[PDB]
């Protein structure tokens, strides 16, 4: 059955990006999915998106732009202590400049640079470069 809808959303977006599509539909919507998409938005990776609200779990139509090489989920949601964070990016990122570990912390869902500035850890959700 369907568990971890964030994985399904990120796989759908990646498969849409690899075919050179411009626009993709995502079902179902979630709070975690919307926060992750906003994080990719602020860094200029997935452009624009709009949430279609029916009286179920909603859907999201995302405007892909072209910069994104790979967006990916990490399952299970491993705890990321602040020291271990450094190891994590050397495992997931192809460079120490670009790419993003996304953590849910008590200060919110954010990337690894902002989590290092706020000096906190949390659960790893994904990465995108």
């Amino acid at each position: 059955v369907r568990m971890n809808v964030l994985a399904d959303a990120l796989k759908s977006i990646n498969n849409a990006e690899k075919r050179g599509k411009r626009q993709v539909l995502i079902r179902p919507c979630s709070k975690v999915i919307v926060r992750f998409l906003t994080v990719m938005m602020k860094h200029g990776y997935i452009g624009e998106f709009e949430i279609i609200d029916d009286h179920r779990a909603g859907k999201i139509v995302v405007n892909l732009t072209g910069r994104l090489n790979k967006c990916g989920v990490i399952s299970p949601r491993f705890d990321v202590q602040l020291k271990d964070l450094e190891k994590w990016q050397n495992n997931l990122l192809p460079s120490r400049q670009f790419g993003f570990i996304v953590l849910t912390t008590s200060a919110g869902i954010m990337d690894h640079e902002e989590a290092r500035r706020k000096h906190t850890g949390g659960k790893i959700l994904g990465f995108f470069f």
């Binding site: 192809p94 460079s95 400049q97 670009f98």
Partner: peptide, 30 residues
Amino acid sequence: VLPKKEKMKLRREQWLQKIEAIKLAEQKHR
């Protein structure tokens, strides 16, 4: 055709080449 060793080397080298090219392009934006 050709052994998988240099296919793996060529793929990882071209990948690091795209990494460096996008790094220089993103550095140019500042």
